């Protein structure tokens, strides 16, 4: 539990850095990815890789001092999977390897338990065809039909060695539901003056929250049914800059601060006048580029990648990396008991997220970020 927590920090640290990278590519667009599924996949990778490839990951993922990493993930993973039967969520991390890569049995057993069915071996060469049909279909069933073809046209070919595919979806069911009769069409500020119609959900209930005068914002925790997962929305008090309004946050945002900003043991409840937009967000991404900028250079290089402890088949590197994520937020949730009269014996703040905001969906038990994203507009 000691190191099985130093890991969450490492993950949340990486989770941030990658966030910023993707934030620069779609500076005026939304962002959405599951840092956790990515950490896990590259975690499994680092097991087989050696030398520099093994130390390049240890850093970019911040495992510099996290003992028993595969166990850490073993837990988080079984946790999130148990949660899949209850929630309408799925999080598939699968790393495919071609037969041509005769995998050391040491490595295969060394990751049999920590990474359940997260390591599959197929034939990309003499069978690229059936393979992409078994995969496309495989994933299409594990994601309960949300992800039809996780594969594109040139995503993969006859020359694919190692393929990391991360498909994840989650249809949110709140702890405290929103009334459909209360959802209403209204503008959403995309900048200081421009707005785009949207479906704002409204409710006045008790939620914990606080103010971060440092970046002039409001933070709030909207727990999902049974508090297993909670969504922390970080909304600035007002749009003060030439773009989205998160310019200052994204600047002052870092591993350390994110922890500070979304600390639930620093925000007291309040009768909030909550209004958040209803939204479905699907985003596929090739983090390859972003990762490079972070430190991963050798892992993709077929001429530098050192995967000794996996397959002695020299001249093999991480081919592609797929990562589709789909987050749907609606009114659905459970019923909730609202304290007697919190309008007088409790603060009566308000959170109108009608402008750009950042949000993270944290797994409360481990404190891991399952979904990290920015909502710049519809």
């Amino acid at each position: 539990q000691g190191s099985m927590d130093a890991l969450q920090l490492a993950n949340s640290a990486f989770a941030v850095d990658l966030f910023k990278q993707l934030s620069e590519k779609e500076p005026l667009g939304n962002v959405l990815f599951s840092p956790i599924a990515l950490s896990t996949s590259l975690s499994l990778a680092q097991v087989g890789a050696k030398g520099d490839t093994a130390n390049e990951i240890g850093q970019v993922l911040h495992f510099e001092n996290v003992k028993d990493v595969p166990f850490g993930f073993q837990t988080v993973t079984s946790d999130v999977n148990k949660l899949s039967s209850f929630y309408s969520l799925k999080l598939i991390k699968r790393l495919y390897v071609d037969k041509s890569l005769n995998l050391s049995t040491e490595f295969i057993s060394s990751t049999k338990r920590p990474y359940a069915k997260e390591l599959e071996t197929v034939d990309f060469k003499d069978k690229l065809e059936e393979t992409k049909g078994q995969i496309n279909n495989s994933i299409k069933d594990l994601t309960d039909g949300h992800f039809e073809n996780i594969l594109a046209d040139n995503s993969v070919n006859d020359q694919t060695k190692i393929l990391v595919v991360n498909a994840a979806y989650f249809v949110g069911k709140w702890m405290k539901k929103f009334s459909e009769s209360e959802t209403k069409e209204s503008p959403f500020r995309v900048n200081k003056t421009d707005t785009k119609p949207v479906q704002m959900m409204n409710m006045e209930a008790t939620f914990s929250m606080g103010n971060i005068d440092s970046i002039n914002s409001k933070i709030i925790e909207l727990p999902f049914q049974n508090k297993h997962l909670s969504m922390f929305i970080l909304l600035p008090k007002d749009v003060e800059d030439e773009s989205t309004g998160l310019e200052k946050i994204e600047k002052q945002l870092n591993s350390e601060s994110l922890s500070q900003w979304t600390n639930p043991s620093t925000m007291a409840n309040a009768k909030v006048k909550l209004s958040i937009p209803k939204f479905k967000v699907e985003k596929m991404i090739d983090p390859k580029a972003s990762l490079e900028n972070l430190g991963l250079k050798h892992i993709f290089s077929e001429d530098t990648s050192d995967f000794s402890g996996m397959s002695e088949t020299k001249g093999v590197a991480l081919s592609n990396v797929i990562h589709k994520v789909s987050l749907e937020i609606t009114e659905d949730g459970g019923d909730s008991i609202e304290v007697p009269g919190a309008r007088i014996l409790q603060h009566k703040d308000e959170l109108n997220a009608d402008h750009p905001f950042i949000y993270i969906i944290r797994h409360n038990k481990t404190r891991n970020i399952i979904f990290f994203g920015k909502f710049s507009s519809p």
Side-chain angles (χ1 to χ4, degrees), residues 2 4-342 344-378:
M4 210 270 103
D5 187 64
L7 173 53
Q8 87 86 175
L9 299 178
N11 285 182
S12 299
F14 161 64
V16 177
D17 314 324
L18 176 56
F19 171 71
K20 320 198 71 175
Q21 228 62 262
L22 300 156
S23 164
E24 303 179 4
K25 295 180 168 54
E26 291 282 290
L28 294 179
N30 301 351
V31 173
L32 182 67
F33 73 108
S34 147
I36 189 64
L38 206 64
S39 300
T40 306
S41 291
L42 270 52
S43 178
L44 161 57
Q46 183 193 55
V47 188
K50 270 198 168 188
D52 275 316
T53 305
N55 271 206
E56 211 161 62
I57 305 175
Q59 280 156 55
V60 181
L61 295 191
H62 307 288
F63 300 137
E64 31 185 344
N65 58 171
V66 191
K67 45 180 179 180
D68 296 295
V69 183
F71 182 62
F73 285 103
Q74 186 173 322
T75 301
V76 182
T77 310
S78 65
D79 272 303
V80 185
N81 289 175
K82 171 278 179 175
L83 218 31
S84 291
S85 63
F86 176 58
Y87 279 135
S88 177
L89 133 90
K90 242 75 172 188
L91 207 93
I92 297 72
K93 296 85 67 178
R94 214 112 305 184
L95 168 144
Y96 298 119
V97 173
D98 191 48
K99 299 203 299 176
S100 69
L101 294 167
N102 191 61
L103 303 163
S104 61
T105 74
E106 172 59 71
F107 171 81
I108 299 182
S109 59
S110 194
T111 58
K112 212 296 181 183
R113 302 190 65 223
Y115 307 107
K117 313 178 187 177
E118 310 201 314
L119 199 179
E120 202 174 309
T121 299
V122 290
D123 200 33
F124 283 132
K125 290 178 57 179
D126 329 313
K127 268 276 60 189
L128 172 89
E129 214 51 65
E130 189 201 301
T131 286
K132 295 203 294 183
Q134 177 251 306
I135 282 179
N136 264 305
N137 199 70
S138 174
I139 300 300
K140 172 260 183 300
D141 312 310
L142 310 191
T143 64
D144 305 327
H146 279 272
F147 291 121
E148 235 58 50
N149 298 68
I150 188 65
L151 307 163
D153 298 288
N154 290 292
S155 297
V156 293
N157 71 314
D158 301 282
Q159 209 73 19
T160 300
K161 317 297 157 49
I162 300 174
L163 178 70
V164 173
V165 193
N166 304 183
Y169 89 95
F170 173 51
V171 174
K173 187 185 191 75
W174 299 115
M175 178 180 79
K176 301 168 178 283
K177 69 176 195 176
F178 286 78
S179 179
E180 306 233 2
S181 51
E182 290 300 349
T183 296
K184 53 207 308 167
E185 311 188 295
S186 37
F188 179 86
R189 273 221 282 183
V190 285
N191 58 64
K192 293 178 178 176
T193 63
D194 308 309
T195 57
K196 289 174 183 168
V198 74
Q199 203 106 301
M200 279 291 155
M201 305 185 283
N202 302 289
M203 95 173 299
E204 185 173 4
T206 303
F207 293 106
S208 98
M209 68 173 273
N211 296 214
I212 308 175
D213 0 58
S214 182
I215 56 187
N216 188 226
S217 300
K218 291 176 180 167
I219 180 75
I220 185 169
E221 178 192 7
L222 305 171
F224 287 108
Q225 181 152 291
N226 273 44
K227 294 207 179 182
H228 290 290
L229 285 184
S230 294
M231 182 197 277
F232 294 82
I233 291 180
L234 178 37
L235 169 84
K237 285 207 186 70
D238 200 17
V239 181
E240 278 135 5
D241 68 36
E242 307 307 299
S243 62
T244 65
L246 312 170
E247 280 182 34
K248 179 160 196 171
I249 296 182
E250 298 204 299
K251 181 201 174 186
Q252 297 208 189
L253 177 62
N254 58 70
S255 173
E256 185 187 295
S257 72
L258 210 213
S259 176
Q260 266 138 42
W261 301 350
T262 61
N263 191 311
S265 288
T266 318
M267 50 207 282
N269 287 215
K271 169 66 64 181
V272 195
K273 277 275 191 181
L274 191 73
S275 39
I276 67 174
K278 177 180 198 177
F279 71 91
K280 192 157 165 63
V281 161
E282 198 158 55
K283 293 301 186 208
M284 167 156 56
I285 68 174
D286 200 330
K288 189 174 187 170
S290 303
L291 292 166
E292 303 181 9
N293 311 300
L294 286 161
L296 290 197
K297 315 175 194 300
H298 300 335
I299 189 174
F300 302 104
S301 176
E302 187 182 62
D303 298 312
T304 328
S305 59
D306 195 307
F307 288 91
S308 304
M310 196 183 105
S311 185
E312 51 301 288
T313 308
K314 212 66 177 190
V316 59
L318 180 50
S319 292
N320 212 314
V321 184
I322 301 183
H323 192 101
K324 278 201 188 178
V325 180
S326 166
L327 179 60
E328 197 195 323
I329 297 309
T330 62
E331 301 85 330
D332 201 53
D335 264 328
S336 181
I337 316 176
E338 279 308 314
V339 293
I344 60 175
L345 309 134
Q346 194 173 296
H347 197 68
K348 197 172 184 176
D349 223 320
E350 68 109 57
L351 189 102
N352 177 189
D354 75 327
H355 54 275
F357 62 81
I358 290 183
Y359 61 80
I360 78 160
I361 284 192
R362 188 154 247 164
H363 173 230
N364 305 311
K365 177 168 172 303
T366 67
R367 267 265 292 173
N368 278 92
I369 307 172
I370 302 312
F371 291 111
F372 200 150
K374 171 206 286 197
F375 187 87
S376 285
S377 122

